[PDB]
Amino acid sequence: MGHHHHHHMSTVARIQFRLPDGSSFTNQFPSDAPLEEARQFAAQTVGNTYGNFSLATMFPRREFTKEDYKKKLLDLELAPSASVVLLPAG
């Protein structure tokens, strides 16, 4: 685009966990911390409600795989902010 200044403020990522309810909750996830943390954190809240929900990013909409969870957050460019999409099954 036209810049040459990256990495200076911080080294963490921000994700917004949404849901069918309409609202969403924002959390703090480092650029290295596992992505599953956001998944388990949301699931731990309700315990058992969504069931078989699917998590994905807003754009460019590429879906999430088993590797996306095991790996870090910034691995898929989540910093400094990102959005998710819940696809519950019931």
- Whether the CB-CB separation of 13 and 74 falls below 8 Å is answered with yes
Structural domain including 64 reads: 1-90
If one counts the domains in the chain, the total is 1
Instruction: Give dist(CA 59, CA 45) in Å, integer.
Output: 26
Looking at residue 33, which CATH number applies to its domain? 3.10.20.90
- H-run or E-run covering 39: helix 36-46
Technique behind the model: NMR
Contacts of 89 (CB under 8 A, 6+ apart): 50, 51, 52, 53, 54
What separation in angstroms does the CA of 48 have from each of 8, 44, 72, 85, 90?
40, 8, 25, 18, 11
